[PDB]
Amino acid sequence: PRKGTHLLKILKQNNTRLESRTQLVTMCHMGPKVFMNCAGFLKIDEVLDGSRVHPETYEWARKMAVDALPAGALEEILENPERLKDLDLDAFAEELERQGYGDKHITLYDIRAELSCRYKDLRTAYRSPNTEEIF
Amino acid sequence: DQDNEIRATDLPERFQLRSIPVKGAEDDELEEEADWIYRNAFATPTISLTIQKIKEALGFMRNQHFEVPFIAFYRKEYVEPELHINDLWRVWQWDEKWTQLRIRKENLTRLFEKMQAYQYEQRALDTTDMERLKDVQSMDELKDVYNHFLLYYGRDIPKMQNAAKASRKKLKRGPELKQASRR
Amino acid sequence: CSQFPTPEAVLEGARYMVALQIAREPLVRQVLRQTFQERAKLNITPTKKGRK
Amino acid sequence: EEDASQLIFPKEFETAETLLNSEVHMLLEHRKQQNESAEDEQELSEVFMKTLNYTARFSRFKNRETIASVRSLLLQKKLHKFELACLANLCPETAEESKALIPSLEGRFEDEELQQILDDIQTKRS
Amino acid sequence: REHNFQPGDNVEVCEGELINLQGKILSVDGNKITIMPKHEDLKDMLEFPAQELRKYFKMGDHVKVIAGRFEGDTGLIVRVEENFVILFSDLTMHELKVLPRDLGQHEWGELVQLDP
Amino acid sequence: MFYHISLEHEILLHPRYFGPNLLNTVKQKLFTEVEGTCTGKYGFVIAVTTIDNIGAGVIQPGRGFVLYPVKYKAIVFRPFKGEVVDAVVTQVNKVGLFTEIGPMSCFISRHSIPSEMEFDPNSNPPCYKTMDEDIVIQQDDEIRLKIVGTRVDKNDIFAIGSLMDDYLGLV
Numbered sequence: 177p178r179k180g181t182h183l184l185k186i187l188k189q190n191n192t193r194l195e196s197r198t199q200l201v202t203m204c205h206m207g208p209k210v211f212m213n214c215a216g217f218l219k220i221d222e223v224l225d226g227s228r229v230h231p232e233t234y235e236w237a238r239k240m241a242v243d244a245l246p247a248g249a250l251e252e253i254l255e256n257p258e259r260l261k262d263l264d265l266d267a268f269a270e271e272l273e274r275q276g277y278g279d280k281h282i283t284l285y286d287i288r289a290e291l292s293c294r295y296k297d298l299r300t301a302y303r304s305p306n307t308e309e310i311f
Numbered sequence: 312d313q314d315n316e317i318r319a320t321d322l323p324e325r326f327q328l329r330s331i332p333v334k335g336a337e338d339d340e341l342e343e344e345a346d347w348i349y350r351n352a353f354a355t356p357t358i359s360l361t362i363q364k365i366k367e368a369l370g371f372m373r374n375q376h377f378e379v380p381f382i383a384f385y386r387k388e389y390v391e392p393e394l395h396i397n398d399l400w401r402v403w404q405w406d407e408k409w410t411q412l413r414i415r416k417e418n419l420t421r422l423f424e425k426m427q428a429y430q431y432e433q434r435a436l437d438t439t440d441m442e443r444l445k446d447v448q449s450m451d452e453l454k455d456v457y458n459h460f461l462l463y464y465g466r467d468i469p470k471m472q473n474a475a476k477a478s479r480k481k482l483k484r485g486p487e488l489k490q491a492s493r494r
Numbered sequence: 495c496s497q498f499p500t501p502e503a504v505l506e507g508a509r510y511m512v513a514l515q516i517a518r519e520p521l522v523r524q525v526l527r528q529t530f531q532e533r534a535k536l537n538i539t540p541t542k543k544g545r546k
Numbered sequence: 547e548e549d550a551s552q553l554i555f556p557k558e559f560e561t562a563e564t565l566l567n568s569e570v571h572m573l574l575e576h577r578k579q580q581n582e583s584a585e586d587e588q589e590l591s592e593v594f595m596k597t598l599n600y601t602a603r604f605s606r607f608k609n610r611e612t613i614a615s616v617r618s619l620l621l622q623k624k625l626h627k628f629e630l631a632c633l634a635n636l637c638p639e640t641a642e643e644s645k646a647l648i649p650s651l652e653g654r655f656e657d658e659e660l661q662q663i664l665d666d667i668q669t670k671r672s
Numbered sequence: 673r674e675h676n677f678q679p680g681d682n683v684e685v686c687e688g689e690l691i692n693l694q695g696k697i698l699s700v701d702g703n704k705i706t707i708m709p710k711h712e713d714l715k716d717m718l719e720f721p722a723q724e725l726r727k728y729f730k731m732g733d734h735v736k737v738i739a740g741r742f743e744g745d746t747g748l749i750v751r752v753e754e755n756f757v758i759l760f761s762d763l764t765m766h767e768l769k770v771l772p773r774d775l776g777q778h779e780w781g782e783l784v785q786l787d788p
Numbered sequence: 789m790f791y792h793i794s795l796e797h798e799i800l801l802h803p804r805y806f807g808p809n810l811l812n813t814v815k816q817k818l819f820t821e822v823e824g825t826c827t828g829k830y831g832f833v834i835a836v837t838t839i840d841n842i843g844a845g846v847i848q849p850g851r852g853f854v855l856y857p858v859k860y861k862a863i864v865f866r867p868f869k870g871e872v873v874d875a876v877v878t879q880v881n882k883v884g885l886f887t888e889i890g891p892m893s894c895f896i897s898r899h900s901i902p903s904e905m906e907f908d909p910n911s912n913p914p915c916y917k918t919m920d921e922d923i924v925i926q927q928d929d930e931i932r933l934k935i936v937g938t939r940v941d942k943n944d945i946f947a948i949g950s951l952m953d954d955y956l957g958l959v
Contacts (some may be wrong), residue, residue: 207321550870562791591824732937750897
């Protein structure tokens with residue numbers, strides 16, 4: 177409540193939409209740690225801003241976009257995935273030992289899934305209520 | 312207004328609402344935390360109804376200051392597959408219980424230390440001070456050590472505290488309200 | 495003493511002393527608590543009200 | 547305007563005679579015993595039950611003679627019937643404490659005499 | 673700023689020559705207020721414009737909130753501060769901060785479900 | 789505090805109750821009519837100890853009922869501002885302590901206990917403690933509290949207590 181109402185009050189008073197997630201720390205007065213925590217969870221209808229990949233992860237996303245053949249690459253890749261099988265978990269895991277410092281294999285998994293479809297809803301598809309529920 | 316100083320800081324809003332403020336770790340007390348939480352929060356209940364992962368999750372919460380959802384979604388490799396989102400919330404809850412237990416143990420230790428000083432100035436506390444205060448692994452047996460102390464020294468706490476309040480006034484020459492007979 | 499005017503009264507007082515010292519010992523409480531955790535029976539009966 | 551600290555009470559209550567928790571316990575237990583013997587299908591209220599057991603937790607005296615004695619040995623002094631009851635209920639140990647609880651006692655007695663009274667009452671506790 | 677004063681209120685003069693005088697309101701006539709000063713030495717009625725008085729309370733008074741965020745709630749004053757009185761709502765049993773200045777869905781007998 | 793006082797009550801007795809057992813029936817109607825009741829005037833009437841005298845039954849003209857003005861002595865619990873009374877803590881909460889003095893429920897607000905006391909929301913049960921844990925007060929503990937205010941309700945009285953004076957507190 178405290179941080180949110182403040183953030184909305186600023187954005188309202190300025191009369192402008194968030195063009196990018198970097199706009200949060202640029203326009204508002206929120207600290208780096210809260211930005212770190214929430215930036216992943218804030219959608220924006222700079223194309224990666226409308227997806228689950230976190231700003232720290234953007235370098236990795238750009239790297240995958242270049243290897244898939246970088247706004248010009250991203251936009252085309254976002255229309256349809258050139259090659260789903262192209263990435264190699266062993267290649268990324270081996271380079272991560274010197275560029276990233278960690279076993280981020282699941283993160284690459286999620287980046288791939290995200291580039292496939294931006295902010296795909298994980299809720300189970302809507303189904304008409306069962307006769308027991310109706311009763 | 313308290314909302315202004317609370318909104319100004321760099322920590323999550325729910326972290327200021329929490330009764331136990333989030334303080335950094337030392338890797339040794341954090342190892343003891345991971346062990347304690349595993350043995351108490353992931354143990355068989357009475358009615359019919361990984362330590363490395365807990366250590367990393369706690370490190371995120373106390374040192375990196377990451378909230379549970381951030382840890383779940385962006386730090387999966389460190390906690391999965393043995394800890395899930397609800398398990399992270401359970402760990403974040405048990406962090407409060409652990410901190411209170413440790414603080415209680417410390418406060419009672421300082422009370423025992425004062426009791427030793429008081430008895431030296433005037434049974435006694437010889438080995439039970441170190442032995443029992445360090446042994447306590449749960450709040451339930453903490454109460455046992457507190458009530459055991461009160462049985463013998465419960466008669467003298469009021470005397471010691473009223474003497475301390477008088478000592479403070481004499482030193483000057485706070486809520487220095489005396490204490491009841493406690494008979 | 496006037497608080498315990500006879501050997502019988504003084505001995506009951508001593509028994510109270512020992513009983514407290516035993517009941518407050520953390521070691522006795524720890525083992526008995528463990529005993530209640532492992533071997534504890536629940537008994538229930540309705541009150542004059544609950545019978546109806 | 548009512549404040550017990552300065553001994554100011556309503557006219558309707560001033561004429562009342564106070565009772566010690568032990569005294570009330572003896573009365574209320576007599577009442578419950580009479581409830582059992584002359585059995586009739588009649589019921590005891592929650593206020594009575596939660597007053598009987600409460601008085602049982604704070605009944606500083608149990609022997610019927612100890613109540614009459616603490617009352618008589620106290621009324622031999624010049625205390626108000628209010629102080630007569632709260633000093634037998636509270637059983638303050640140090641005179642300084644008795645005056646702290648009942649401020650009316652300040653200047654009423656010397657500390658050593660007051661301590662004598664309190665010591666006597668305390669020896670009567672059962 | 674039209675005052676919430678009513679006969680029977682305890683007030684303290686906050687402005688003018690008679691500052692810190694305590695008295696009880698007798699009558700309210702627009703923004704003119706007649707009060708009975710609370711001193712063994714002063715028995716006569718005094719009239720003050722409503723801007724010059726402020727309500728005051730002591731711990732343990734029983735009061736009703738008649739304005740603002742909690743209007744209609746009641747409780748005992750547990751602490752008093754120059755800025756505000758904090759009272760314990762009798763029935764909803766919450767602490768509740770208030771300014772000293774402030775102290776049809778169903779019908780009686782209506783049947784309601786509560787749980788299913 | 790408990791007091792023994794002479795009180796009076798006027799009971800309306802239905803004509804069907806006339807007859808031999810009449811007066812004993814009055815005695816019995818009186819007990820059930822005042823015992824357990826509570827009034828701001830006298831406090832809680834804990835129990836009727838004796839009936840002084842039953843007045844002459846005045847037959848009310850128009851309705852058959854005869855009203856008996858009966859004088860009796862009862863044990864009554866009257867709290868006062870400034871009282872210092874032993875209370876049993878029944879429930880501890882983030883906002884003060886709920887305690888009971890005989891039949892009278894009483895509350896000690898968080899703002900009326902010494903500055904050192906703080907709430908421990910996870911103890912078994914929750915309790916208040918000082919920064920040194922020297923005094924810890926929870927359920928079933930006995931507290932000497934000083935009454936500072938009271939409110940009178942329909943057949944009930946509720947009091948607000950304090951632990952601010954020099955010799956109040958635990959046991």
